[PDB]
Amino acid sequence: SLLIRGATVVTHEESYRADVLCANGLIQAIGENLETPSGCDVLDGGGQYLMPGGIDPHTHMQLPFMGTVASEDFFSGTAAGLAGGTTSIIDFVIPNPRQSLLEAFHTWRGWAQKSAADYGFHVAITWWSDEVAREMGELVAQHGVNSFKHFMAYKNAIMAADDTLVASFERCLELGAVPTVHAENGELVFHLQQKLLAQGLTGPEAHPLSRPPQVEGEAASRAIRIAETLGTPLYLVHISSREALDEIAYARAKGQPVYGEVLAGHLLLDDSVYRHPDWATAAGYVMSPPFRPVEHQEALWRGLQSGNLHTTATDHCCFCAEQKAMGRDDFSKIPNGTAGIEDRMALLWDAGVNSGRLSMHEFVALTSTNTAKIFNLFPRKGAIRVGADADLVLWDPQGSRTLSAATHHQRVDFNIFEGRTVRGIPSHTISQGKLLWAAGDLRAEPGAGRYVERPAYPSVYEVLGRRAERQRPVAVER
Amino acid sequence: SLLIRGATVVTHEESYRADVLCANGLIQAIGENLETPSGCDVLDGGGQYLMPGGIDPHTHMQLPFMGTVASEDFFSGTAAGLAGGTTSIIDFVIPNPRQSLLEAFHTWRGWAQKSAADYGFHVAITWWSDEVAREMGELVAQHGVNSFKHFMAYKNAIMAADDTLVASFERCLELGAVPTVHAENGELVFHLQQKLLAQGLTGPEAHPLSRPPQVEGEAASRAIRIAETLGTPLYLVHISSREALDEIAYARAKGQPVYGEVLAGHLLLDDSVYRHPDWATAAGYVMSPPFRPVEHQEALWRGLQSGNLHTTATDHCCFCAEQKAMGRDDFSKIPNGTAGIEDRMALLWDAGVNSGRLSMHEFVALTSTNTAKIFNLFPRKGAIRVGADADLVLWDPQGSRTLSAATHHQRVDFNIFEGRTVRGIPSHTISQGKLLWAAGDLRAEPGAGRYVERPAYPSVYEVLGRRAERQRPVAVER
Amino acid sequence: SLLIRGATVVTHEESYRADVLCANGLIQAIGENLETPSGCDVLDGGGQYLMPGGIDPHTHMQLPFMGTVASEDFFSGTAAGLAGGTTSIIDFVIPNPRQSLLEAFHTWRGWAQKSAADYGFHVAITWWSDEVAREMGELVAQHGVNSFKHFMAYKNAIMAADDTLVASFERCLELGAVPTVHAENGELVFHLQQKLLAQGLTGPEAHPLSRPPQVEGEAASRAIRIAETLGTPLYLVHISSREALDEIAYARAKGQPVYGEVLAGHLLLDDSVYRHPDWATAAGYVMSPPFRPVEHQEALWRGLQSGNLHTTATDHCCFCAEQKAMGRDDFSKIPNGTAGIEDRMALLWDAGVNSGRLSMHEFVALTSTNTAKIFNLFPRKGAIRVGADADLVLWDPQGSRTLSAATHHQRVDFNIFEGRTVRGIPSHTISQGKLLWAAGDLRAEPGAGRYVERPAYPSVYEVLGRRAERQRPVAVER
Amino acid sequence: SLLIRGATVVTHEESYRADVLCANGLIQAIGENLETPSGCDVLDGGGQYLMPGGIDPHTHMQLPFMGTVASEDFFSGTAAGLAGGTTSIIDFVIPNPRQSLLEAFHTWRGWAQKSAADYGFHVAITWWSDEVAREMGELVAQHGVNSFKHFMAYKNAIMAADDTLVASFERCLELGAVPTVHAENGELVFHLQQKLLAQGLTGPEAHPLSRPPQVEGEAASRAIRIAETLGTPLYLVHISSREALDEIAYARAKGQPVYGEVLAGHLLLDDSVYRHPDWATAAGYVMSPPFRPVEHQEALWRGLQSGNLHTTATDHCCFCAEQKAMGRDDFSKIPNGTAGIEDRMALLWDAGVNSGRLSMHEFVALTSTNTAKIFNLFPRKGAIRVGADADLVLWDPQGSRTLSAATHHQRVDFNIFEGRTVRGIPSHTISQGKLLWAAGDLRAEPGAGRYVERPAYPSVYEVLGRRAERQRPVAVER
Ligand SMILES: [Zn+2]
Ligand SMILES: [Zn+2]
Ligand SMILES: [Zn+2]
Ligand SMILES: [Zn+2]
Ligand SMILES: [Zn+2]
Ligand SMILES: [Zn+2]
Ligand SMILES: [Zn+2]
Ligand SMILES: [Zn+2]
């Protein structure tokens, strides 16, 4: 039991002064001057904002990938998220091609058991068969999964060509699941990788050039039009480019339910990082899609302000220096990914709220609420109201923090925002009504987190069903 | 006290089964299986949706205009809104040029005392001076006004040119008031009127021709760029054209807070109505901006679906055949306006929700919540939650109604949708906790409604303030 | 706008020939041979007195009371007032014991929405608690209330005992509010009722005997000495007895601000009405305090001439024959109250001015100006001057009226001055600058009236503050 | 022309912030921020109260009386008033017995010529005849007299017995004039003087004992009951006693128009002053009626608070020590009279307003407005309104003054309030639009004052006529 007193509550749509009482993992009461019940502890939020805790819908804790295993595991990752105000995640079960989805699912459940805060899974469709379709049904009905990931890159690995995307998206529709997509054209990437390697361009500066922005635009257009065609919603992960974002706006402008995710890295970093002359420094930044020329960062902010990008995530996929160095003589073999779970909320607040680019309300929407609506977890999560999960962050608008690999809780030796100072930080993080992060002190305990099931058929399927019924074809009499 | 039992509650975000208890003007409790307190009636809403009652932010009850007085008054018009599910209105105080705003405000407050449902005012800036600027402050500080209308058409009457728009918008920023605008280029309208009359085209068929869609798009661009330049939000009334909508989309794509209102008539009728062979019929459709060719309807529906249009309203401004007939020999003298307060919600439900263009949540957002947020009345209005005003509509998705001047409650002899049959209707309407419409029985009572005051500084001005500091000029030294 | 021409202006202090221009709710100009602005209507007031319209600070429109509801509602009652030259009222919010003051105020505000002329509210303190005290402060700071009513009668219902009277009067002093009192000793009344009923004396003739004059004198004494002890002003409603009037005179002769109100009915009728041979007719007169032996009348006229009574009112509280008949076998169950709003001015004029007891100036003082000063509405009301509200009555000293239920506009089947003919009548009544009564034609409109907010700390509080300083207790050292 | 800027206007009934513009002897405008018209001087009234100038309706400038002539003359007396905030006086024409009234009038007009501020006369009826009766008519019709003084004391000089009172009062009624009376029983005074002196009690301490309070109460009773009987108003000068005040209260409580004037001396001093061991000090206080035992002072304050005393004045009748000393061996030969014209307003303000005994509005009523109303000069005087005479005083509540014969401007060697310190004083005094007292400086000019006519029939005669219509006695037939 925990009563937060004196703060201003801030939701995705309003702000008001009120105390919030938590017990048994839930919000119990919200109102002015509530009394403390005996047993309960008190937290003074005077001068602070109390917001729904962050949901990071894009994590890869201890992912085996590109020859190795991410250096952050489910506990260290989730604990670091907590230190940064993030209170739940959604990670990805990634079966190898031809591996049973269910078997990969149970393996991933075993790995995620050590989570310190709430977690769930998307499941990736890395090959296709009747078995796959059947196992998707089983995951939805029995394992609380309602979203499936598709990768349009990684040729001769896990790439889904059209036949798969069509068949899988069709199945998603049958199941009321949300297809999500990593959108980059895998043929062009493969092709550009070979050509650049053949020219002797082997360093990280080659990485951006192996996948310039139109490669992402193309795949997005494609995913979106497959989606339009089969009558499914669509969530595109890590949008980095104007081209991809413009495809998103074009589709929403026709009334299509398409949602975009953006990472802080793509909002704040440009592709000059990859030309850095220290190898390890430049490789620190190697992720897909890569950081982009500067005109792209402002397009993405505009996307957030105009309602064409809807959520923020980190794609938290950590590799240490020695692991990155696997691609020392071949950039295509640098394990791809950057850390960011701890730093998402602060970076977005600092660059977005302080600048007056975003409101506090949009900050909540973009850090928790939209993700929760999209994946059918609202108002269980991403909401301050009676009966909702007690996942909250007490935000100190004038608190200072300098981001650094020497000081972060992320178990990785590199921070893409090394040396950056932000104003506005999580002074306290509450998960399941417990205080897990309190002014410098992290109290994450392995296994405290719960697996979060997400029901099928978010509400967008209502609307889609009325549309499909309205446009059912009818034969000419004769 | 009134208990609405057995319905599905539908808000701007979600749908869930619960009972809602109203008393003393407010929603007191929401939940399943609520007990009936002693002395409270019960309403059975099984198989029905219970939604916030509609807010129509654009009405002109008993307006004196174009040489006469609108045939619907504040009583009959609010009563008619109630019969159609609309529970509050915002109307316009329109001073003559050189007439004191406070004086016209007090005349309109006198006329509105007969309202049967909650009501409020925007106040129009029809001329400029220091005194006008002073009176604006007093209206905001003392009389619950937080928005000011400007007309960009009506040359040689109430048109505001650039010098007034600039001075007034600047005053709005200082006061935390939202500037709203009627966007048509008045010089062009004037020119084309003169020219059509010179050509010998004096009939109603000449009206759309006198104000083609680019005249709206120009003026929209202008007011929008003025707003951008001075750092204010902007609300555009009765957007009817692709051109204006495209200007709004363009502005919003750059992060600018621009809002757009649309009428059901502009969503559903085209300009063929002006060619009707019966003079009075043609004249009945005469309003500004006029009905447009079909491509514009489609573009406006997509606007609603993409979030570039935000509110619905009616521009409820009623004149009977004998009043319209004042322009018998000169289309420019036909009093401009049509009726719609009663029909807005069902028109929109029937066209948007049954077709699957809009979800029920977006219907709620477009008919109340968004208006409420924009004008700083949320969650007092547009919300089903404890403490909120008990303004509600119970909606029968299988009910039917044919729109007709023979049977509508609007005190006017013409309906622009004569003969249209809708499916999905308001079975019951509740205002201030009272059952004012019940399945064919209208129980509106003169005077019952309250003047609704709207606090200044909706949250958008906070964001703008931070934005302004960030982008302030900095002198060169040295 | 309204030009009243050729009348003699009669105020609380002077009479002079002048024309009076009304526009925008207010008196715009006063002067000899004013010019008629175009659009303005002219009212010919030749040979008439133009006085401030009547204020009746004691009404109970549609009161639920003694197991029923008054037959006059806020529209019918205020329309009737207007026809009788009365242009505004103060009515009473009467919470049930243990009911929130705010909740009652809100209910009453909704019932008064239908009022046709300006109206206000006193709020009754019918029980006591910290929350009552808080609510009193809120009514005063936000809801325009500056007077609180207490009942010393009605044992075992809403009686305020001495602990409540002290606690409330002290709270009124804190808030700059005026305490008002219904002064009868509830315990004596309770006791005499039981006694008379046990003797089998069940008819209306018992009603006066159940509450003889000394019961009023005692309560008045008590409320006055409480007020004196705590340092507050005091207003005593409906003074009917020599004894209570002598208590007011005694207090005032020691420099205490005590005000007294009187009804025309206690000026003009005596207790023989209760021995009427027709049950229903005797019952028609039952109100509290009841009508008195005849020497009380003459004492009250003298109160008015000496400045020991200050206001006139009606305690307008209407019950039809059927409702009175609820006490057919038990006088204590006959609903208490009589009608008067329409008749007060003419009755006072005819008995007071025509006989020469009172000057015309005293008549204005007693009918509007004093009430206005006492409750902090002077000179907004009860004054003829530029800028005051245009609430005016045009009084024809040669006119004549026979009072009758058959023709009065009060919605009740009984008039306590049935068959009385008066000389000097209101020919026209103007409220908010509109002509609402005119030579026999009532043109009152539902809802037209406005809620009139009354500020705290009328000027008697400055004097009491300096008194209190001079009387401060000085300690002796240790 | 004089603009008085930034003061708070204080009247007999309200206060409000406004400037006041005077020109041509008159108030021209009253409003917030008035422009200084050219030619006009400006007076900074910031932080001060602007009030109608005092009217002293009881002065005896250079009166021949008790074998000598009053040491103050019309110029020095009116000058002194100005310095004390008094702007107009009413003095007395006192003809000798058998002397023509017109004759004494013209002499007194010659005397009053030198006045520095506005002045008028009452005329004393010191004997009776058909000629006296005729001349009274002439004085009212041609010389702007509307009030006649009667002396009930001074046996064997100017005393009017009952037959003169009756005939003069009846004649006042025929002419529309107001009877005023010095009420002491002359026979009892004469007897007591004789008896005190035969006892050898020749000192000033015998002076009070020669005319104890009941001698005043008796004459007041008698004057009142004459007025009542003949149907006239009545103004009683210098009331000093409980007894007389109680007769006033009793008469007013029968609805009779009787007014009471009081002097600061009788509010503030007691009879112990006549016992001072120094002869000439004790003789300084000798006037009629004498100062009284302390209980009379609190009773008079209460008469003022209760509305049984109506005006303040001074009976300004100055004699120096050597003239007083004429009664060194015989108190009955001490010329009677004290000074106070200069001190009235400050004494009343300090003792009445600072104490919280009176409001500031009451202070204005008591120092000018009621006198004005009573003698038919309202609103020419005693009023702050457009068209009134610009007689005004600017009051500095924080100013201080110590009253001394050594420093006052009154041309007399004695001050009955020597050494008394007052808080609240007139800083500036304006008469006929001109600043005559300012910052400690007097600028009075001999002859500047005008003679002020008072028209007959003040409105009290309207009420009285209504009564006399109703007293038609009717013969018996059945
Ligand atoms: Zn990816
Ligand atoms: Zn990823
Ligand atoms: Zn418009
Ligand atoms: Zn409009
Ligand atoms: Zn009562
Ligand atoms: Zn009452
Ligand atoms: Zn005298
Ligand atoms: Zn005298």
Author numbering:
A (entry chain B), B (entry chain A), C (entry chain C), D (entry chain D): 2 to 479
What does the publication say?
Crystals of P. aeruginosa dihydropyrimidinase were grown at room temperature by hanging drop vapor diffusion in 10% PEG 8000, 100 mM HEPES, 200 mM calcium acetate, pH 5.9. The crystals of P. aeruginosa dihydropyrimidinase grown under this condition belonged to space group C2221 with cell dimensions of a = 108.9, b = 155.7, and c = 235.6 Å. An asymmetric unit of the crystal contained four crystallographically independent P. aeruginosa dihydropyrimidinase monomers, in which two zinc ions were found in the active site per monomer. Thus, P. aeruginosa dihydropyrimidinase did exist as a mixture of dimers and tetramers at pH 5.9. In the crystal of P. aeruginosa dihydropyrimidinase, the four molecules formed two pairs of dimers, B-A and C-D, respectively. For the tetramer formation of P. aeruginosa dihydropyrimidinase, many hydrogen bonds with close distance were found: these bonds (<3 Å) include K374(A)–E14(B), H13(A)–E14(B), R386(A)–E14(B), R386(A)–E15(B), R467(A)–V354(B), R468(A)–G357(B), E14(A)–H13(B), E15(A)–R386(B), V354(A)–R467(B), G357(A)–R468(B), H13(C′)–E14(D′), R386(C′)–E15(D′), R468(C′)–G357(D′), E14(C′)–H13(D′), E14(C′)–K374(D′), E15(C′)–R386(D′), and G357(C′)–R468(D′); however, these residues were not found for the tetramer formation of Thermus sp. dihydropyrimidinase.
Dihydropyrimidinase catalyzes the reversible cyclization of dihydrouracil to N-carbamoyl-β-alanine in the second step of the pyrimidine degradation pathway.
